[PDB]
Each structure stands twice: as C-alpha cells, then as structure tokens.
C-alpha cells in the first residue's frame, strides 16, 4: 500500500517493510528486522537473599521495576567502544536508614550493607 | 510549601533516582517476591 511503512509480525524476528521513493516514478522496498526483545519478568535475584522458610509480615517491601531507558522512537546513539544499555532493572525500597556492618575474625574483614526500617 | 521539609525531601530522591534512571518510561513493575519464583520456574 501507499503507507510509508508496514510492520510484519513473525508468522523469528519482526520485519519492518518501508517503501522508499527516490523519484516520482521510481520506488523500491527495504526490508529490515528490528530487535524482538522480550524483557524477562523474572530477574534473577535469589542472589540477594537465602529465601528463608518463614517470612514475617513487614512494613517494608521490595519491588522490581523494569525501566526502558529511552523513549518511544527516540534515537540510541552509540559511542565507539562503549555498549548501549537499553533496559535497567532497579530495586525500589517502599513501605529507612543504611549503614555498614563489619564481621572480623583473626585479621579477616568482610563488609555488609544493612538497610533497615 | 516550596520550603517545606516534605518538598525538600521529595526533590532530593528525584535527583537520586534520576542519577540512576532518568527519563525512561515505567514499562511494567513487579514485586521482588513474585520476581524470584518466575526466575526459579524458568531455571
């Protein structure tokens, strides 16, 4: 059709079909796959806590927020030798003071971050 | 009030967050506890 761009869903990657018209009587079609990224609603953070057998009700509650770093249709500019991050997965504290905890035994040091309410 | 303690604290965490995230749109949010099971299920 006359539409400048048609996006074809996969019947592995989505295909964006765009009509390009160099002159008033000549035109051609450029076919481009895009990225087909799925953000996992499962971010691996069993790395945080040992998943105790019992969990008491807490006023505090952690949250996992998915963050698309760039706006819809906005350009992502790539600086040489640096990779572009598109998605950030931050943890939001919601319900608080933070301070260090140090465990020492026979000249050995191990730092910790204690975040409490 | 612009000089209220609430206003000062609210603007403070906006800067702290923006220095991490910025202008991005919140796509979808999930609790930590329900974002751990799904990882276990996939693994």
């Amino acid at each position: 059709s006359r539409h400048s761009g048609i996006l074809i869903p996969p019947g592995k990657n989505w295909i964006y079909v765009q009509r390009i018209t160099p002159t008033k009587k000549k035109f051609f079609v450029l076919v481009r796959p895009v990225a087909t990224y799925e953000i996992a609603d499962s971010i691996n953070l069993a790395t945080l806590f040992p998943k105790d057998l019992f969990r008491e009700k807490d006023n505090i509650q952690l949250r996992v927020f998915n963050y698309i770093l760039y706006g819809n249709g906005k350009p992502t500019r790539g600086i040489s030798d640096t990779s572009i991050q598109l998605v950030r997965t931050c943890l939001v504290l919601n319900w608080v003071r933070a301070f260090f905890v140090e465990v020492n035994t026979k000249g050995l040091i191990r730092d910790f971050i204690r975040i409490g309410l | 009030p612009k000089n209220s303690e609430i206003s000062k604290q609210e603007r403070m965490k906006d800067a702290h967050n923006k220095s991490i995230v910025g202008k991005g749109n919140v796509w979808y949010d999930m609790s930590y506890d329900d974002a751990i099971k799904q990882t276990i299920e996939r693994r």
Partner: peptide, 23 residues
C-alpha cells in the same frame, strides 16, 4: 511484553561538510 530496536546510523553534519557518498 515486547520492545523493539531498529538499528539506524545517523550522521548530523554541517552544511559545508564534503560528502563522499551519493544519495
């Protein structure tokens, strides 16, 4: 549940720049 990223290379250049690629 799905987001997309088309790759395009864009160069913004001054009008006086000498372009060695044809349209």
């Amino acid at each position: 549940d799905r987001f997309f990223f088309i790759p395009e290379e864009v160069h913004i250049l001054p009008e006086s720049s000498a372009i060695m690629v044809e349209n």
